[PDB]
Design a protein around this motif. Sequence first.
Motif, mmCIF file in Angstrom:
data_model
loop_
_atom_site.group_PDB
_atom_site.id
_atom_site.type_symbol
_atom_site.label_atom_id
_atom_site.label_comp_id
_atom_site.label_asym_id
_atom_site.label_seq_id
_atom_site.Cartn_x
_atom_site.Cartn_y
_atom_site.Cartn_z
ATOM 1 N N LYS A 11 13.509 38.655 57.519
ATOM 2 C CA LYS A 11 14.261 38.144 56.374
ATOM 3 C C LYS A 11 13.591 38.570 55.069
ATOM 4 O O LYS A 11 14.247 39.065 54.131
ATOM 5 C CB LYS A 11 14.330 36.615 56.437
ATOM 6 N N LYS A 13 41.941 45.160 18.880
ATOM 7 C CA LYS A 13 42.469 44.096 19.742
ATOM 8 C C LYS A 13 42.763 42.856 18.919
ATOM 9 O O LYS A 13 43.831 42.248 19.057
ATOM 10 C CB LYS A 13 41.528 43.758 20.909
ATOM 11 N N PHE A 62 43.952 25.301 22.313
ATOM 12 C CA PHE A 62 42.858 25.585 23.271
ATOM 13 C C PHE A 62 41.924 26.751 22.899
ATOM 14 O O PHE A 62 41.184 27.248 23.756
ATOM 15 C CB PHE A 62 43.442 25.781 24.677
ATOM 16 N N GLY A 63 41.949 27.182 21.636
ATOM 17 C CA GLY A 63 40.972 28.144 21.111
ATOM 18 C C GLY A 63 41.475 29.548 20.823
ATOM 19 O O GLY A 63 41.015 30.179 19.871
ATOM 20 N N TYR A 64 42.435 30.030 21.611
ATOM 21 C CA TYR A 64 42.798 31.459 21.602
ATOM 22 C C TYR A 64 43.883 31.740 20.556
ATOM 23 O O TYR A 64 44.013 32.865 20.063
ATOM 24 C CB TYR A 64 43.246 31.949 22.994
ATOM 25 N N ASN A 105 17.454 34.189 48.690
ATOM 26 C CA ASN A 105 18.790 33.591 48.795
ATOM 27 C C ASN A 105 19.795 34.627 49.294
ATOM 28 O O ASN A 105 20.600 34.335 50.169
ATOM 29 C CB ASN A 105 19.225 32.919 47.492
ATOM 30 N N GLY A 106 19.667 35.854 48.798
ATOM 31 C CA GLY A 106 20.449 36.991 49.269
ATOM 32 C C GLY A 106 21.210 37.522 48.084
ATOM 33 O O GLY A 106 22.307 37.052 47.790
ATOM 34 N N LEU A 131 48.330 27.573 22.414
ATOM 35 C CA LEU A 131 47.261 28.572 22.421
ATOM 36 C C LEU A 131 46.208 28.218 21.365
ATOM 37 O O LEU A 131 44.990 28.233 21.638
ATOM 38 C CB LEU A 131 47.839 29.969 22.182
ATOM 39 N N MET A 136 23.489 33.861 41.103
ATOM 40 C CA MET A 136 23.186 34.661 42.334
ATOM 41 C C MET A 136 24.375 34.787 43.320
ATOM 42 O O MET A 136 24.174 34.949 44.528
ATOM 43 C CB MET A 136 21.933 34.091 43.037
ATOM 44 N N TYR A 137 25.604 34.743 42.799
ATOM 45 C CA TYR A 137 26.820 34.941 43.603
ATOM 46 C C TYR A 137 27.509 36.250 43.249
ATOM 47 O O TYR A 137 28.575 36.566 43.779
ATOM 48 C CB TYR A 137 27.767 33.764 43.402
#
Lengths: 125, 207, 40, 170, 201, 103
Positions: free
Chosen positions: E93, E177, E199-201, E28-29, E196, E1-2
Amino acid sequence: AVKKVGKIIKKRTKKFTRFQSNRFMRVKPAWRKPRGIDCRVRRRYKGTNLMPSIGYGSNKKTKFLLPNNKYKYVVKNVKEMEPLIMNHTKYCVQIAHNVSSKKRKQIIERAKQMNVSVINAKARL
Amino acid sequence: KHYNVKGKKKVLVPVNAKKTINKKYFGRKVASKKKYVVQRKLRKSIEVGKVAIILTGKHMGKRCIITKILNSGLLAVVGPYEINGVPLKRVDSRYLVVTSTNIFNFENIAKLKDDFLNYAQDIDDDSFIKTLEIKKKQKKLLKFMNNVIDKIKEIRKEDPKVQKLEGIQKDIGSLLKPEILKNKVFAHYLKSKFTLRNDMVLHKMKF
Amino acid sequence: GKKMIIKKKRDEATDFERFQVYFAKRELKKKMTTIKNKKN
Amino acid sequence: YAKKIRNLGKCAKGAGVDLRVHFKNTYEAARAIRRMKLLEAKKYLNDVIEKKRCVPFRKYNGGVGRTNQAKEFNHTQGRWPAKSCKFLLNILDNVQANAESRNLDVSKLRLIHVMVNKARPGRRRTYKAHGRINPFMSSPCHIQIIAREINISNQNRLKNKSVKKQQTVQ
Amino acid sequence: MYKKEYVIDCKGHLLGRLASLIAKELLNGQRIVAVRCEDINISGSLYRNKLKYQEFLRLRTNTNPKKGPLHLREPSKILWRCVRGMLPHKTYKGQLALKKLKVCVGMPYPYDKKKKYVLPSALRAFRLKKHRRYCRLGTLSSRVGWNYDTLVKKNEVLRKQVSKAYYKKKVNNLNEKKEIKTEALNLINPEQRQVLENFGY
Amino acid sequence: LQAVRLYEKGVILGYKRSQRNQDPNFTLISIKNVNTKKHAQFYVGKRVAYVYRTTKHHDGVKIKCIWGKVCRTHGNSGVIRAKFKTHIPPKAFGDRVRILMYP
RNA sequence: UUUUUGUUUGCUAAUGUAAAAGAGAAAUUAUAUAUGUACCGGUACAUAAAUAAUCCUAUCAC
RNA sequence: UUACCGAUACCAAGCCAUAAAAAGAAGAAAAAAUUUUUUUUUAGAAUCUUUUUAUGAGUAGAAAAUCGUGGGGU
RNA sequence: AUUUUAAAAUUAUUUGAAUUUUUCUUCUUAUAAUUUAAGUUGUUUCUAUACAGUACUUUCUUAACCCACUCGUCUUGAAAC
Ligand SMILES: [Mg+2]
Ligand SMILES: [Mg+2]
Ligand SMILES: [Mg+2]
Ligand SMILES: [Mg+2]
Ligand SMILES: [Mg+2]
């Protein structure tokens, strides 16, 4: 809320207004304690006006001190100024509302000589 | 001086008692009856050559290398200016996130440590705190816009302590820079600003 | 299992290590971009 | 007079002492007028006395009708209070005369203050019902009119902060 | 919710639970676009649901039914009503929160192209045992006089083709890609490449 | 990238509450990706800043800020209680708050 | 549309945001299975199966 | 089964009042200036001062201390 | 203006024992300091090189969250239809 400034704690900046003083002009805001069965203020329901109480009182040490930290002393006359030559830090003069402009000036002059604060020097200025 | 109560061993720095307080029924007296304050004691992490983010200041997020633990408690830090842009700066331990990384754990740079230490030692606590006169001078300019700023800058430059600090910084840069530059990735890291992003959750980040 | 271990690694990384990875990605992107351009 | 003026050389006043017209109607008329050029106001008043343009009754609007003319003021209700208008017209004329007496050009005069107060009522009796006397009072009013001719602190730290912000923006 | 605006694909969700989830977020908004509200589900049988809705409909205001319970019977509107039920909508509100909610039937002019999230706490698959009777909200609405169901379905079908087309293109792009990455892993440096890989990539 | 984050994003919810009693001394903050008590506890000392805009300028600016301390976690779901120097107004109750990485 | 400076007689210069700090993310579908690809809903082969626990996108200043 | 939220009740600390309890008819402390000046205080009002501890709901009612109005003597 | 003392504790010394052999082992002979005693002290900024400003204190005015029923009255019981 509580209103700290330094060592001065005030527990209640808001005045206690008479119940319903807001509703009827005839009822002045000056606190009057509601007697009367069913009052709701007397009974202290959440959301109504609060009742002034001795819990609200200011600490014995700082009580009548103004934001200055000085007890106010009202002064009508030069002679009266003299008691506070030996207390020029603890007390601060207020010149009485009825004192004439010339006399006021004189009083102010005296206060300056004494190093004593005058809280209403500006009257008729 | 130190006291060792219940196994702590706390270390006592001698403090001055500045504040006077009004006595009960006759005249004033100094507040602090105590003469020796316990020393700050920094966390088991803040070392002598670790890279650390500066969280709070104008240099916000720049990663700078720690220089000296400064007796007072708050410590000195440098993004060896000419590399990063962070000068010789004093900062509290709290406005720093010290990383796990250490300059003097790289194989190239580690051999220049003694010199660095010496340089750090040369720095003092009082060399940061600006004197009153300088401050007064600065203030005096406030009675056009950019001109004022320039004047202020000039004044700052003028201060002998400031000059000394600058010199020290320069020396440090001279000592350190080339090696750092050579380790290219590390140099880049030093240059760059630390940022939080979506994915970097913060509570899980062991950095 | 692989992905789990990758996640673990990511979790346990140092700031510098994260920065290293970022740098690597940037490099790759540069190269990748160039190749894309070539293709086009 | 109730206003704040500064230069009364540019103003022209005018009053009615205890006008035998209804306060409410005349109040409405005054409202309709206010902030008009004087001549235009006069014109409007004349129109209303010849029943061509209404005065819209917005405040004291209990029972007042539903004229076609009120559309001009975005309103439904309006009236053509004749007597009130006449009284108001007289006082406008007086104002104009005063202006003339001074050196004020009546083209450039705005009604800056059209005040209508209610005055002390004249008392009469009306007879009702089962031997009951009731009052049958007028509601006269005072009218005041005023026409009028018309045509930090820096600080060093703060400064530094500002400069820094500017730099950041750049 | 951000996030700025969550689009919620309401298909396969359990009405009430979904509504509850929405409501808190709103409070919450957080703007929430409940999209594809024809396909929300209710946990009763269809008939039972209809009966309940019939009962609801029956409660109008005796005196003057212009006022009194408005029986909004587009599925989206039903959803909205439900959401409102779980908000303090008589405050300011609450009102604001309510306003923040938009609901749609099918998917239109931005919400085709926005990502569509899912509330898995309120998914019928996860919340009802498969031997239980459920009901598609759209059908229920139709039964109680909504009418625009077939049309909506048609629209959805039309949209799906477009989506599929888009997806093919996307897939192709992804593949390209990947290919580029494969090519251009070899062209970097060694150590960086190794890092790289680690760390997965 | 112009400007750097250096805080966790947050949402100032209501005050600490009963069902129908207010307690404006504490506010409740939701911190973005923090879902549990434990995780919330990481932030417990951190400083929180509610920055907000106004129409009139003040110290020559339109933005002002109220500061708080993050006092304690708030039950199971990663919400935290935050105590501010001056109480935050309920005009704020949907708003963004910045939970800084200092300390 | 673009640029600059600004919004620090009732008036005649003029400001407000329930929410910017990367507010990043368009298959579809089933839930005791899906999705593609190729043929004629069916067949064969791939693909996902802690799926935002991911991927994308940031810092290389002039 | 945990964890949580949750009162003016509970706990810790502060302050007010009440009640009781201790107890009470002589003296330089400091800072700032530059060894001497300046700055504040240098208390002792028994229904009073200092400190302590506990307690504090309230209609009818009771009491005490306060506050104010018209006039009198001082 | 002498219970912010006394002692406890601690550090650095000094005499004599102890079985928990111990860089916190304990007691005790003496001496200095210290604070863990004997209710918060410091450092650095800022306000600020200001005389009122947009900051600061304060009144009113609006919102917003939560709460709040017409007082008086007889009455077991009044927000009372
Ligand atoms: Mg009663
Ligand atoms: Mg009582
Ligand atoms: Mg209520
Ligand atoms: Mg009865
Ligand atoms: Mg009653």
